């Protein structure tokens, strides 16, 4: 079998930052009337590899902004892997110990030429010390690109609710607003 929880997601140039106990929706209620839900297109086209790409706008400063994507592994056991132990803080670790090296995969493209290009970064909120962990970095054009990666043992990212929050450094260059294209949404590990 494989890790499979696929359609939460959210947008804001601003910020909120919890402890290891905030659940999926807290990206919304926190961001002050300065954030946005991912729509039916993102919820449904990106579900598996295909060709009807999403395209969506992004509120921004001088090109910079933050895209936050989010899942809870308490859903993964309950809805997909029923036998697994849920009911203690150890669940973060013991689920990770089974999961091994999890990857996130996520395919996108920029609203600029095939040669014109932008600079972007993966962050994941560290669910052991509560700091933004930047551990992959990317550049893009009109071409489809994964900006997911292997992120490995998830003991450092499962909060005790079994929720996890990313944020991605969206970019456009020295321009006044931006739009982005998306094809995929997958949290991905092996066990058999």
């Amino acid at each position: 079998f494989y890790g499979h929880i696929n359609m939460y997601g959210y947008v804001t140039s601003y910020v909120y930052n919890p402890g290891m106990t905030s659940s999926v929706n807290q990206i919304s209620a926190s961001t002050e009337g300065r954030g946005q839900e991912v729509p039916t297109d993102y919820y449904m086209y990106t579900s598996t590899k295909n060709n009807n790409t999403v395209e969506l706008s992004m509120q921004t400063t001088s090109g910079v902004s933050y895209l936050y994507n989010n899942f809870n592994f308490r859903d993964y056991m309950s809805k997909y892997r029923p036998q697994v132990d849920l009911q203690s803080d150890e669940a973060r670790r013991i689920v990770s110990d089974y999961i091994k090296e999890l990857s996130i995969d996520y395919y996108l493209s920029a609203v600029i030429p095939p040669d014109e290009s932008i600079e972007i970064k993966l962050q994941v909120y560290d669910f052991s010390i509560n700091r933004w962990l930047t551990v992959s970095i990317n550049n893009l054009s009109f071409y489809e690109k994964n900006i997911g990666s292997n992120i490995g043992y998830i003991k450092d990212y499962l909060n005790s609710e079994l929720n996890m929050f990313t944020r991605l450094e969206i970019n456009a260059g020295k321009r006044d607003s931006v739009d982005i294209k998306v094809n995929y949404l997958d949290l991905m590990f092996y066990y058999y």
């Binding site: 729509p39 039916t40 297109d41 009807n52």
Partner: protein
């Protein structure tokens, strides 16, 4: 403009040659189907 967006939903597929709409009886209806009916026609007309 685009009717593949909500509520109109238009889940037609020209690349499959989706060819006919087979509506179902006395129905609380996803109007989602309907744009997609004329969409089926609009591919072959176009």
């Amino acid at each position: 403009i685009n009717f593949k967006g909500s509520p109109y939903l238009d889940r037609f597929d020209p690349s499959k040659d989706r060819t006919k709409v087979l509506f179902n009886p006395d129905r609380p209806l996803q109007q989602a189907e309907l744009n997609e009916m004329q969409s089926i026609d609009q591919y072959y007309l176009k």
